[PDB]
Structures are given as C-alpha cells and as structure tokens.
Amino acid sequence: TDTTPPTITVPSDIIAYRGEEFEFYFEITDDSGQVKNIELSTFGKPLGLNWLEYSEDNFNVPGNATSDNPLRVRVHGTVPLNEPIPADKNRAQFTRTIRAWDAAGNVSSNITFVIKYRAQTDKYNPADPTITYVDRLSSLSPSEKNAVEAAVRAANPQIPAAARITVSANGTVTITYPDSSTDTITANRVVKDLASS
C-alpha cells in the first residue's frame, strides 16, 4: 500500500507589494504520482486571507505529481492597497501553512510559507526628471508645474500610471503611489532658474 504522503516544495522569498498582483508556485510530488488536493491554512485554522487564490486545475488526476513532472500550483492575488504596515515594516508578513493529500488518504504534515508584503515605494525608485527651467524658483507657474509633472512622468514609465504626481510652489515633487506610500524629489533636482542658465 501507499503509506507515504506527498512532498511539497515552497518558495523561499515571497514578496508582494500592496495593490499589485503577485504569484508564486508550490511544487508537489507523491510516490504514487497522484496528488488529490491541498489545504492552505493558519496552522490548521482558517487561512483568513480572502485575497489569496489558487487554481485546482489538474488536481486528483493520475500522473499529475511525479518527480519528473511535479504538480505546480499557482497561487496568486493582490494584497489590499491599504493593508496595514506597522512601524517595524518587517512585521508586514503572514506566515501560513500548506499540506497535500494523495489519492490513498495520506496527508502531509503542514509546512510553512511566508508572504511578506511591502509599500509600493519600496518597489519604485524614481529617476530625476529633465530639469524644468522656471522664472521664479519660489513660485512656479501652472504651466511650469504641468511641465515638471510631465518631466517626472516621462523619466519614470516603470512607475504605475495610477500613481499621482504633485508639485509644490518651489518645484518639490511628490509621487504618491496607489497605496498612498510616497517618494520625493527635492526642488534642486527638478527646477532651475531660467535666466541664470
């Protein structure tokens, strides 16, 4: 008889950014070559993460889980935009457990995986814009602020379109990402006096 449960390989460094779709894979094998299903939990208790999803495609099919061709389970979702990040941002993670059944009733013992989530500015590092030349450094005109915003946007296509770029009276740039985290560009790297140049 089959008395050996499936073996699960977990990803070692799962990093998610708030408001951005992410994915990772579990790889599962069984000596029988067949895995019936899995369970994601909090050490046997409810998962408690409704934004976490996975496909049951190819579950409980003969030969779906061999050493040569493991069952690859795609887990995906989006950490909510406003998921709380405490003062110590290392605390921004969820430790959860996974186990799997074979077709003979053997279930593996829960093993852990960790979903770390971070603010969007942790992912994005804005390049300085081409300098906008202005008439008064202490008081930008509406067209100068438009130009600055355009310049910052142009120098940073990798930044999400849903991020909002604002410009202060002295040309200080604020980039506010969809999750409301921010990056700043100081005025001296954004604007210069036109006449002096």
Add this chain to the structure above:
Amino acid sequence: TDTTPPTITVPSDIIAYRGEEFEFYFEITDDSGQVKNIELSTFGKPLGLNWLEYSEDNFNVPGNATSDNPLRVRVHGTVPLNEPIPADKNRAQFTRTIRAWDAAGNVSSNITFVIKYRAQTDKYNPADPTITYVDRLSSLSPSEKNAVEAAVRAANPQIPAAARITVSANGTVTITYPDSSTDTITANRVVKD
C-alpha cells in the same frame, strides 16, 4: 474740393483676457473714398500700450475706404498676464482714441474706443466631466484623483493646456489658469460613491 474728415466705426465690445491674444477691427470711411492714415492715442497723448499693434495694409490708396467697402484696420495684441485688475470692473479697461485723415488732410475728431480686460476665468467655464466613482467620498485615493483630473481635462480641450487641474481629498476640483485666476468644480459634479 474735399473739406470733410473720415468717419470711424469702432467695436462696442472689445473684451480681452489676460495673456490671450485678442483682435478687433476699426472701419474707416471717407467721402473721397480714400483714407490716408490713422492715429491711436490717449486723447492725443501717447497711446502707452506697447503690447497693442495694428496693420497699415492698404493705407493711402484711392478707393480703400468707400461706404460699401470701408478701410478695415486689424488691431491685435495681448494684455499682460499680470495686468492688475481693479476691484471695480468699470476701471478694468483702457480708454483710448482714434483719429483718421484723408488725402486732403481733413482730420477727424478723436473717436473713443475702450479695451476692457479680464482675468482668464472670466472667459473659461469648465464643462462637466464624466463622473468618477470612488471608494470614500471624503477621502479619494491617488488613482481616483488621477481619474478625476483626466476626466476634467478630456471634457475641456478648450481650457488652456497650461492650466493646472488639482483635486482635493473630497474630489473638489480647482482649475488654475496661466494668469493664476481660478475656477472650481464642486465635488458632486465630479465624484460618486
């Protein structure tokens, strides 16, 4: 022998907006059918409007100023972006005079014309944007503010590109024109839950 000066028609409503080029026409007629030249002044004194210019095309040509085809003098210019606007609008204007003469040298009296000038928001009146649906009416997200600005811009190609559109936490829209005058679009014309 011609002893009668030309007659001049001026526009009744010359309204210029700060920083934006305006144009208008004088129409001049003489009984001879010919007008030689004109003069713009401040009741005979220097005009004092260096940003105003007019064309001298077809001056002093026979037949350039008949009853049926008057001399049409194109005037244009741009009132300074930072021209101070008096609290009383009846003083937000330049009162000036034009005279003209024919080939015999008959000169008209000084005829008054008035260039009124106004802030850019007196011209612009923002159209309604497509409504943007938001999560919290009292606290818009960055993405929702982007959506709002984009909608206001898309609905208003006639507003200067140089105008800056800002969005507050509650979806109130401020449009700041190049001359720093403003319009406001109330939140309830902008966002919905």
